[PDB]
Write a protein that binds this DNA or RNA. Structure first.
Ligand code: K
Ligand code: MG
Ligand code: MG
Ligand code: MG
Ligand code: MG
Ligand code: MG
Ligand code: MG
Ligand code: MG
Ligand code: MG
Ligand code: MG
Ligand code: MG
Ligand code: MG
Ligand code: MG
Ligand code: MG
Ligand code: MG
Ligand code: MG
Ligand code: MG
Ligand code: MG
Ligand code: MG
Ligand code: MG
Ligand code: MG
Ligand code: MG
Ligand code: MG
Ligand code: MG
Ligand code: MG
Ligand code: MG
Ligand code: MG
Ligand code: MG
Ligand code: MG
Ligand code: MG
Ligand code: MG
Ligand code: MG
Ligand code: MG
Ligand code: MG
Ligand code: MG
Ligand code: MG
Ligand code: MG
Ligand code: MG
Ligand code: MG
Ligand code: MG
Ligand code: MG
Ligand code: MG
Ligand code: MG
Ligand code: MG
Ligand code: MG
Ligand code: MG
Ligand code: MG
Ligand code: MG
Ligand code: MG
Ligand code: MG
Ligand code: MG
Ligand code: MG
Ligand code: MG
Ligand code: MG
Ligand code: MG
Ligand code: MG
Ligand code: MG
Ligand code: MG
Ligand code: MG
Ligand code: MG
Ligand code: MG
Ligand code: MG
Ligand code: MG
Ligand code: MG
Ligand code: MG
Ligand code: MG
Ligand code: MG
Ligand code: MG
Ligand code: MG
Ligand code: MG
Ligand code: MG
Ligand code: MG
Ligand code: MG
Ligand code: MG
Ligand code: MG
Ligand code: MG
Ligand code: MG
Ligand code: MG
Ligand code: MG
Ligand code: MG
Ligand code: MG
Ligand code: MG
Ligand code: MG
Ligand code: MG
Ligand code: MG
Ligand code: MG
Ligand code: MG
Ligand code: MG
Ligand code: MG
Ligand code: MG
Ligand code: MG
Ligand code: MG
Ligand code: MG
Ligand code: MG
Ligand code: MG
Ligand code: MG
Ligand code: MG
Ligand code: MG
Ligand code: MG
Ligand code: MG
Ligand code: MG
Ligand code: MG
Ligand code: MG
Ligand code: MG
Ligand code: MG
Ligand code: MG
Ligand code: MG
Ligand code: MG
Ligand code: MG
Ligand code: MG
Ligand code: MG
Ligand code: MG
Ligand code: MG
Ligand code: MG
Ligand code: MG
Ligand code: MG
Ligand code: MG
Ligand code: MG
Ligand code: MG
Ligand code: MG
Ligand code: MG
Ligand code: MG
Ligand code: MG
Ligand code: MG
Ligand code: MG
Ligand code: MG
Ligand code: MG
Ligand code: MG
Ligand code: MG
Ligand code: MG
Ligand code: MG
Ligand code: MG
Ligand code: MG
Ligand code: MG
Ligand code: MG
Ligand code: MG
Ligand code: MG
Ligand code: MG
Ligand code: MG
Ligand code: MG
Ligand code: MG
Ligand code: MG
Ligand code: MG
Ligand code: MG
Ligand code: MG
Ligand code: MG
Ligand code: MG
Ligand code: MG
Ligand code: MG
Ligand code: MG
Ligand code: MG
Ligand code: MG
Ligand code: MG
Ligand code: MG
Ligand code: MG
Ligand code: MG
Ligand code: MG
Ligand code: MG
Ligand code: MG
Ligand code: MG
Ligand code: MG
Ligand code: MG
Ligand code: MG
Ligand code: MG
Ligand code: MG
Ligand code: MG
Ligand code: MG
Ligand code: MG
Ligand code: MG
Ligand code: MG
Ligand code: MG
Ligand code: MG
Ligand code: MG
Ligand code: MG
Ligand code: MG
Ligand code: MG
Ligand code: MG
Ligand code: MG
Ligand code: MG
Ligand code: MG
Ligand code: MG
Ligand code: MG
Ligand code: MG
Ligand code: MG
Ligand code: MG
Ligand code: MG
Ligand code: MG
Ligand code: MG
Ligand code: MG
Ligand code: MG
Ligand code: MG
Ligand code: MG
Ligand code: MG
Ligand code: MG
Ligand code: MG
Ligand code: MG
Ligand code: MG
Ligand code: MG
Ligand code: MG
Ligand code: MG
Ligand code: MG
Ligand code: MG
Ligand code: MG
Ligand code: MG
Ligand code: MG
Ligand code: MG
Ligand code: MG
Ligand code: MG
Ligand code: MG
Ligand code: MG
Ligand code: MG
Ligand code: MG
Ligand code: MG
Ligand code: MG
Ligand code: MG
Ligand code: MG
Ligand code: MG
Ligand code: MG
Ligand code: MG
Ligand code: MG
Ligand code: MG
Ligand code: MG
Ligand code: MG
Ligand code: MG
Ligand code: MG
Ligand code: MG
Ligand code: MG
Ligand code: MG
Ligand code: MG
Ligand code: MG
Ligand code: MG
Ligand code: MG
Ligand code: MG
Ligand code: MG
Ligand code: MG
Ligand code: MG
Ligand code: MG
Ligand code: MG
Ligand code: MG
Ligand code: MG
Ligand code: MG
Ligand code: MG
Ligand code: MG
Ligand code: MG
Ligand code: MG
Ligand code: MG
Ligand code: MG
Ligand code: MG
Ligand code: MG
Ligand code: MG
Ligand code: MG
Ligand code: MG
Ligand code: MG
Ligand code: MG
Ligand code: MG
Ligand code: MG
Ligand code: MG
Ligand code: MG
Ligand code: MG
Ligand code: MG
Ligand code: MG
Ligand code: MG
Ligand code: MG
Ligand code: MG
Ligand code: MG
Lengths: 48, 275
RNA sequence: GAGCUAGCCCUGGCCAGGGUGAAGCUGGGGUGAGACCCAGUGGAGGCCCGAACCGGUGGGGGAUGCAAACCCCUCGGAUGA
RNA sequence: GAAUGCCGGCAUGAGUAACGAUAAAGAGGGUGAGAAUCCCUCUCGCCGUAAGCCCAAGGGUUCCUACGCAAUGGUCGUCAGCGUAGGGUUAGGCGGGACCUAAGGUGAAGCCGAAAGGCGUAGCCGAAGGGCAGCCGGUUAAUAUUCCGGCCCUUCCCGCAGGUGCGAUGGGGGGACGCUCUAGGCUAGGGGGACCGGAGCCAUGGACGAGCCCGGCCAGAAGCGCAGGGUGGGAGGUAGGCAAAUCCGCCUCCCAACAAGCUCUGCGUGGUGGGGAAGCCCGGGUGACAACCCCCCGAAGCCAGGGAGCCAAGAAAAGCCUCUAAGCACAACCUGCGGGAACCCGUACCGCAAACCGACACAGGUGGGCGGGUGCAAGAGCACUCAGGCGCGCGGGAGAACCCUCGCCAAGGAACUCUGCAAGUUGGCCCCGUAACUUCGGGAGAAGGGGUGCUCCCUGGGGUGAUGAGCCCCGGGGAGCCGCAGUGAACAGGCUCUGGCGACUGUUUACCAAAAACACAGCUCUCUGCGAACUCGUAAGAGGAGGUAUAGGGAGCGACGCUUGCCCGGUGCCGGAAGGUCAAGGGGAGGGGUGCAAGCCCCGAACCGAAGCCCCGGUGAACGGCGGCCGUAACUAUAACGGUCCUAAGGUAGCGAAAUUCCUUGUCGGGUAAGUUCCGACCUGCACGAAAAGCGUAACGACCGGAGCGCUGUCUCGGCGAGGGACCCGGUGAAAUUGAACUGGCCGUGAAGAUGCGGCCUACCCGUGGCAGGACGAAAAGACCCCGUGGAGCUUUACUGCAGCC
RNA sequence: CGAUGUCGGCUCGUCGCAUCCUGGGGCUGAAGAAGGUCCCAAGGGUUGGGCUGUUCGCCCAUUAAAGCGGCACGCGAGCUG
RNA sequence: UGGGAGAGGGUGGUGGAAUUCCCGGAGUAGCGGUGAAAUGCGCAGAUACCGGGAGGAACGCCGAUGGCGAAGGCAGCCACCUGGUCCACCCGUGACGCUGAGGCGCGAAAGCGUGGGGAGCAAACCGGAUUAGAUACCCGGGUAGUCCACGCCCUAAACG
RNA sequence: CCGAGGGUAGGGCCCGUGACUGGGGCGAAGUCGUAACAAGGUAGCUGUACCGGAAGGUGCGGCUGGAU
């Protein structure tokens, strides 16, 4: 049947992307924390 | 004269439509339409604030002239009577001798080809607009400004009218569509005559699809819900109210007056409504 | 977190074929004039049958499955909410 | 040593289930150490509104080639979407950007918020919508509307020439629009030809033929032809389109009006460039100087911004045209021609799937376009087939039980069973014919029947064409032929009567309920005078609504018909400028602390003092409620009638053993051989009853009862047969579970149901296929139940608060 | 209670005997025939249907007879639901 | 042809009396109702009086033993539209007539449907009295209805 | 071919019968009340509507076949 993951590059970048995170207190904390944690990617990869 | 249908579907048995016979133009004046932003009942938060709205036919808004004192003394010709989907009344297209074109709502009896005019000296004729002080007591009247130069506010729906009943200082007494007796300032403009298309009220939508075409989505009785949803929700089997009938938000809904008490305009309502 | 799902907004797309034959129109009759009747024209409808499409009624299978809801047969809607 | 402990390793089950659609295989020849599985050939089967082809999304090198086979591949592997390497994606015209705006998002102005932040006009962003210039063929192992060829085209820059009041982010026009139906003319596509071109062919009884087989085009600028779309012309006035305006709007006059003219597309033609089958031979070469013609069918596509009708009344902005303003008229713009200039990103490949979403090469899911032929009334249905693509990545045998999917069945025909569950029956088209009832539409495909193939003859109309031939479409009659059977295969209702519920089409518990539940038109009550009420928000601000009482919110009822009785004492809501109570506050009688005192300080009576409450009224489609006992008639029985107690008032009409009836299978009637169900009645209604509506109701229903006809493997009552498994052999090889086990029966005993204790009995050791009685078998720390001063949802006249409102 | 699945039906039986029938008997208010009642006896047998989920029961038509109980109200790792 | 009388019909408008309600004023201890009363209304200021206003319905006197219409029926006043009818003259047509099964139209009240309207009146209903009872008569309330438009109903002691 | 008739199916009309139900007629001495006849003690009658154990009552409009 129809599953829950329906990839969509525009939806991925616009929802979880770098610029969505920086435009919001919570998202900037998500960036702060993933940097402190030393994540290799701060943001989901989408090819655009 | 509402038009019936033969019962050749279950829904056509009761469905009635307007006759549209007063209509002489069937596409709007391009320079007077603009897109009507459909809301679904949602405010600027995205939140539903008026339940069960949405999904009705697309409409363009006809810009209507509810002032009519921008062009005092300039006569106009009535060029057409058109369908307006944004109101119950029909609208009338006016050609001013200016060349300027404007929509007013079509009073009852207005005939294509006649002239109308606005101002303190206008004849007392169906279609004409005067400040209230110059309209003779007894006159049936519509599209009544409620405060000078703020725009026509009262008696705009199909068939409605206000009657001038008397005068008192700067104010005149109106019997509003609802029966209420209210002082309105004399400088407030009104238009002579009742609003047209009085058969509107006798339309029988006939089926649920018709409500859907108007942007009306199904209304769910609180008695059909659960207690998390509504004061009337719950109960094994069917259930009477079991408490004073209440809204979704808890407040009582049979009799409870809701006009704010200390409202400055109370000094101007003479007698609350009738019937 | 509304890339699932629920609702709404904006902008596009889709619905083989067959059937029924509303109003109106025209003519004929009718009458004081009419209502009205008749025939032709017409092509209405949350109209009918049925694919796509959307469903999920009953039964059988499946039950460490092909599948964490599927398969077969059957069945509902299919110009409309 | 235990924690259903944690991490890891390794066992058991077991060579067991399984190896993922039952569309299907066989052989020969290659290659290789090795071949059912790789390659080639021939035979066979499967898809063909796809299981083929082209887009988009998503994926991201999987594409092509060489070399490989450890692992991945459910077996094998020499093969591969796998490993290593090399190569491969070429655009002014395709898509997107250097254009436009939609929702929405953002946001100079501005507004609001403890902070964070929330709003918000313009503007900006934002596309699968608007707008915009490339078609046909060739080439690569792999890209191509991109490279090449041929023919076309756009914008920008500069120039030359001609022309003009040139000039805009401003004004105006235009862009610019719905649904259903649809005309004319075309094209796409397809059928046929005795015509043109073609390698060949004559089989096996016949055919050298008007034979078989194959093909008979595609693009194309200007011009012209055809079909359409768009559009009046002139003058005078002018106060409107937030400056101006010759524009546009409005008024008047004149000429034109199915037209014409001008303009723009579509199609045809068109200089020219291409392509070009079968077969034969080895992707290619031939065929081939290939031919490239005629007739017919014909779109849902094109002309298009076409036409008609209808109500629910159908985006915006730019490009573009016109108008003028600053300006500038040496400029500038329009037109024609010439030269120059023309950037960024995508382009491989999969794409209904082994490359996307489902942990898997997963029977699931995934939007748009093309989707050929013949027959079946039509069609995208169905059968078979084209082009094209496949046989589904374990096989070989055997022909047990049993299971699955399937076929048939003597006599019977629902006797099966909770139930005709299931499966039969019926089944398309044509014609005949069709009841109660009805809201006059319907019920209706009611029911029930007859026809249906092929041949010959006569004959009617229509389209194309010419008015004819041909082609093509719709028919009428007559005479016959065959078989068991002519919608001969595939696809295609069983029917009727009678109840309950719900009017109806719709909607719902994604994944155990599709319903009588929700919704629904419609009815009523109620709130709401507009800065509405109401809703979200601390607010600003929104929605309501650019609406205005024929409107908007809330509530109940639920088409329609006939109706909806009595009670306002309690609760609610509505009304009541009196009275009673009533907080802060006003007032200050009268005290008190202190000080030498002026003072300073604290308490404080009457009285005045809001909402609320009390109190007085109203109000039922507001919350709700609508009695008891005893007696009585000239047979009896029963009480129209009476007595009395109580109530705020004692249930009306209608209906009633009911989706409600306890006693109950009430009683009587019907249906049946027989009827706890069903239907119709009766009424002592445990415990109907009038908008939580009452009683009905045509039509409707995958709703739930009862009955009958038809027909059946449901059954008496089972038999046979098919295929896929089960079974045997080769290959690969799990799982839950498991204290250890050397693990029998009875009668007893035992924590009360013993392989394990006692006595007796029986029993050589180990397997395979089967069956499920036990191992209180597995699974899941029982959902029931109780317990915990455990939790959560919900309610209210429980408590106590808060928002909100007064 | 770290689970002993709970009515009825179907299938499949097996057992007890306080015996429904068949066999053998005594007493009889046993003429005969048919019964009544008790004794012995478990070898076998003990029907088909209507109603209801029903067990049971009632009814229809038969019968030699239409027996009563146990087996976790026998039997859901056998089926139904 | 010339004239007449008339509540004949339809439409539009419009006048004054009275009632009820509302607002202001003034005033206070009852009003109302009957056979008598009670319910009811009234110190929260009723009744009685004055002024203002809203609204509906019916038109006093004239008015009659009157008039008109086929009937049912028709009454303030104005205008418009329209019917029947009588008289005069003796002008025109030349029996063109009478009745009339069917058909068609009209048809008081009440009633019904969809809207509107609602002052007074008033089935139902509530209460107070009366009575053995009083589902009546009388009294206080009161909803349909009575009024308008359109569409039905088609009855009558529709009688002379 | 037609054809008595037979069979399948569906209609129409009439007759009988049916739990139960509706009123109607009649029947020496039942119960309730007193609606009409007199102004019948509220003049009666009337078509319609609504209500009530029952006759009846009430509303609307009509008739005199109403008395004084
Ligand atoms: K329980
Ligand atoms: Mg889904
Ligand atoms: Mg889907
Ligand atoms: Mg998605
Ligand atoms: Mg995307
Ligand atoms: Mg996207
Ligand atoms: Mg997206
Ligand atoms: Mg976002
Ligand atoms: Mg982002
Ligand atoms: Mg911050
Ligand atoms: Mg920060
Ligand atoms: Mg990571
Ligand atoms: Mg790094
Ligand atoms: Mg992130
Ligand atoms: Mg109708
Ligand atoms: Mg009709
Ligand atoms: Mg109109
Ligand atoms: Mg516009
Ligand atoms: Mg808006
Ligand atoms: Mg916004
Ligand atoms: Mg709301
Ligand atoms: Mg809404
Ligand atoms: Mg309108
Ligand atoms: Mg409106
Ligand atoms: Mg005012
Ligand atoms: Mg209308
Ligand atoms: Mg209405
Ligand atoms: Mg609408
Ligand atoms: Mg509604
Ligand atoms: Mg509802
Ligand atoms: Mg509920
Ligand atoms: Mg519920
Ligand atoms: Mg919630
Ligand atoms: Mg709550
Ligand atoms: Mg609640
Ligand atoms: Mg409740
Ligand atoms: Mg409930
Ligand atoms: Mg209940
Ligand atoms: Mg419920
Ligand atoms: Mg109930
Ligand atoms: Mg209650
Ligand atoms: Mg409440
Ligand atoms: Mg409130
Ligand atoms: Mg009011
Ligand atoms: Mg369709
Ligand atoms: Mg026709
Ligand atoms: Mg027409
Ligand atoms: Mg339909
Ligand atoms: Mg049909
Ligand atoms: Mg299913
Ligand atoms: Mg589904
Ligand atoms: Mg089935
Ligand atoms: Mg299974
Ligand atoms: Mg499952
Ligand atoms: Mg399936
Ligand atoms: Mg199927
Ligand atoms: Mg079907
Ligand atoms: Mg269809
Ligand atoms: Mg259908
Ligand atoms: Mg230990
Ligand atoms: Mg351990
Ligand atoms: Mg543990
Ligand atoms: Mg562990
Ligand atoms: Mg390790
Ligand atoms: Mg481990
Ligand atoms: Mg291991
Ligand atoms: Mg071991
Ligand atoms: Mg092993
Ligand atoms: Mg092995
Ligand atoms: Mg085993
Ligand atoms: Mg397995
Ligand atoms: Mg498997
Ligand atoms: Mg598997
Ligand atoms: Mg299959
Ligand atoms: Mg095979
Ligand atoms: Mg082979
Ligand atoms: Mg091999
Ligand atoms: Mg090998
Ligand atoms: Mg091969
Ligand atoms: Mg061969
Ligand atoms: Mg095909
Ligand atoms: Mg991937
Ligand atoms: Mg390998
Ligand atoms: Mg190897
Ligand atoms: Mg290998
Ligand atoms: Mg290696
Ligand atoms: Mg492997
Ligand atoms: Mg695999
Ligand atoms: Mg090799
Ligand atoms: Mg690897
Ligand atoms: Mg490549
Ligand atoms: Mg190019
Ligand atoms: Mg571009
Ligand atoms: Mg640039
Ligand atoms: Mg954006
Ligand atoms: Mg953009
Ligand atoms: Mg675009
Ligand atoms: Mg081109
Ligand atoms: Mg190359
Ligand atoms: Mg210019
Ligand atoms: Mg337009
Ligand atoms: Mg438009
Ligand atoms: Mg559009
Ligand atoms: Mg339409
Ligand atoms: Mg072409
Ligand atoms: Mg063809
Ligand atoms: Mg000017
Ligand atoms: Mg075009
Ligand atoms: Mg050559
Ligand atoms: Mg189409
Ligand atoms: Mg078009
Ligand atoms: Mg058009
Ligand atoms: Mg815009
Ligand atoms: Mg200048
Ligand atoms: Mg110059
Ligand atoms: Mg020029
Ligand atoms: Mg650039
Ligand atoms: Mg690039
Ligand atoms: Mg490419
Ligand atoms: Mg698929
Ligand atoms: Mg597709
Ligand atoms: Mg693939
Ligand atoms: Mg997942
Ligand atoms: Mg995996
Ligand atoms: Mg595979
Ligand atoms: Mg797959
Ligand atoms: Mg073909
Ligand atoms: Mg067919
Ligand atoms: Mg295969
Ligand atoms: Mg397949
Ligand atoms: Mg074998
Ligand atoms: Mg199968
Ligand atoms: Mg067969
Ligand atoms: Mg056979
Ligand atoms: Mg048989
Ligand atoms: Mg039978
Ligand atoms: Mg039979
Ligand atoms: Mg049966
Ligand atoms: Mg069932
Ligand atoms: Mg069939
Ligand atoms: Mg019948
Ligand atoms: Mg019939
Ligand atoms: Mg019937
Ligand atoms: Mg019936
Ligand atoms: Mg009918
Ligand atoms: Mg038939
Ligand atoms: Mg025949
Ligand atoms: Mg034949
Ligand atoms: Mg023969
Ligand atoms: Mg069918
Ligand atoms: Mg329902
Ligand atoms: Mg329904
Ligand atoms: Mg119902
Ligand atoms: Mg109904
Ligand atoms: Mg309904
Ligand atoms: Mg439907
Ligand atoms: Mg469900
Ligand atoms: Mg569920
Ligand atoms: Mg659930
Ligand atoms: Mg679920
Ligand atoms: Mg299910
Ligand atoms: Mg359903
Ligand atoms: Mg529901
Ligand atoms: Mg309904
Ligand atoms: Mg209703
Ligand atoms: Mg209403
Ligand atoms: Mg709030
Ligand atoms: Mg705050
Ligand atoms: Mg707004
Ligand atoms: Mg409303
Ligand atoms: Mg409902
Ligand atoms: Mg309901
Ligand atoms: Mg009460
Ligand atoms: Mg009260
Ligand atoms: Mg009360
Ligand atoms: Mg209660
Ligand atoms: Mg109570
Ligand atoms: Mg009643
Ligand atoms: Mg009963
Ligand atoms: Mg009942
Ligand atoms: Mg029930
Ligand atoms: Mg009950
Ligand atoms: Mg019972
Ligand atoms: Mg019972
Ligand atoms: Mg019984
Ligand atoms: Mg019987
Ligand atoms: Mg009884
Ligand atoms: Mg009751
Ligand atoms: Mg209720
Ligand atoms: Mg019904
Ligand atoms: Mg009826
Ligand atoms: Mg019915
Ligand atoms: Mg249904
Ligand atoms: Mg259903
Ligand atoms: Mg049956
Ligand atoms: Mg039967
Ligand atoms: Mg069988
Ligand atoms: Mg077999
Ligand atoms: Mg062997
Ligand atoms: Mg092996
Ligand atoms: Mg392996
Ligand atoms: Mg051991
Ligand atoms: Mg051992
Ligand atoms: Mg052992
Ligand atoms: Mg043993
Ligand atoms: Mg024991
Ligand atoms: Mg034992
Ligand atoms: Mg032992
Ligand atoms: Mg031992
Ligand atoms: Mg021992
Ligand atoms: Mg032992
Ligand atoms: Mg022992
Ligand atoms: Mg033994
Ligand atoms: Mg074995
Ligand atoms: Mg075995
Ligand atoms: Mg076992
Ligand atoms: Mg077992
Ligand atoms: Mg087994
Ligand atoms: Mg145990
Ligand atoms: Mg066991
Ligand atoms: Mg066990
Ligand atoms: Mg489990
Ligand atoms: Mg636990
Ligand atoms: Mg536990
Ligand atoms: Mg548990
Ligand atoms: Mg529970
Ligand atoms: Mg317990
Ligand atoms: Mg406690
Ligand atoms: Mg405790
Ligand atoms: Mg607790
Ligand atoms: Mg337990
Ligand atoms: Mg356990
Ligand atoms: Mg248990
Ligand atoms: Mg367990
Ligand atoms: Mg059985
Ligand atoms: Mg014996
Ligand atoms: Mg025996
Ligand atoms: Mg025995
Ligand atoms: Mg039984
Ligand atoms: Mg039992
Ligand atoms: Mg029983
Ligand atoms: Mg037993
Ligand atoms: Mg025992
Ligand atoms: Mg027991
Ligand atoms: Mg028991
Ligand atoms: Mg048992
Ligand atoms: Mg059992
Ligand atoms: Mg089971
Ligand atoms: Mg069981
Ligand atoms: Mg078990
Ligand atoms: Mg067991
Ligand atoms: Mg007093
Ligand atoms: Mg006083
Ligand atoms: Mg009034
Ligand atoms: Mg004469
Ligand atoms: Mg003469
Ligand atoms: Mg009448
Ligand atoms: Mg009384
Ligand atoms: Mg007395
Ligand atoms: Mg009244
Ligand atoms: Mg008379
Ligand atoms: Mg009397
Ligand atoms: Mg008397
Ligand atoms: Mg009397
Ligand atoms: Mg009365």
């Amino acid at each position: 049947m129809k599953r829950t993951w329906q990839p969509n590059r525009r939806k991925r970048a616009k929802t979880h992307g770098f610029r969505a995170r920086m435009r919001t207190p919570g998202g900037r904390k998500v960036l702060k924390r993933r940097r402190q944690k030393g994540r290799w990617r701060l943001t989901p990869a989408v090819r655009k | 004269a509402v038009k019936k249908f033969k019962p050749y579907t279950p829904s056509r048995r009761f469905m009635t439509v307007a006759d549209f016979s007063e209509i002489t133009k069937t596409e709007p004046e391009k320079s007077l339409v603009k897109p009507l932003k459909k809301t679904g009942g949602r405010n600027n938060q995205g939140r539903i604030t008026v339940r069960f709205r949405g999904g009705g036919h697309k409409r363009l808004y006809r810009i209507i002239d509810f002032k009519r004192w921008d062009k005092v003394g300039i006569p106009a010709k009535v060029a057409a009577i058109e369908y307006d989907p944004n109101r119950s009344a029909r609208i009338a297209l006016l050609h001013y001798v200016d060349g300027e074109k404007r929509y007013i709502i079509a009073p009852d009896g207005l005939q294509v080809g006649q002239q109308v005019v606005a101002g303190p000296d206008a004849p007392i004729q169906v279609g004409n607009a005067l400040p209230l002080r110059f309209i003779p007591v007894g006159t049936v009247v519509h599209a009544v400004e409620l405060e000078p130069k703020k725009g026509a506010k009262l008696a705009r729906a199909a068939g409605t009218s206000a009657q001038i009943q008397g005068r008192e200082g700067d104010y005149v007494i109106l019997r509003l569509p609802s029966g209420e007796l209210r002082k309105v300032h004399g400088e407030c403009y009104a238009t002579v005559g009742a609003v047209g298309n009085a058969d509107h009220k006798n339309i029988v939508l006939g089926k649920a699809g018709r409500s859907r075409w108007l942007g009306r989505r199904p209304h769910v009785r609180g008695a059909a819900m659960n207690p998390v949803d509504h004061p009337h929700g719950g109960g094994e089997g069917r259930a009477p109210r079991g408490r004073p009938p209440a809204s979704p938000w808890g407040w009582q809904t049979k009799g409870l007056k809701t006009r704010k008490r200390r409202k400055p305009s109370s000094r101007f309502i003479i007698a609350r409504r009738k019937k």
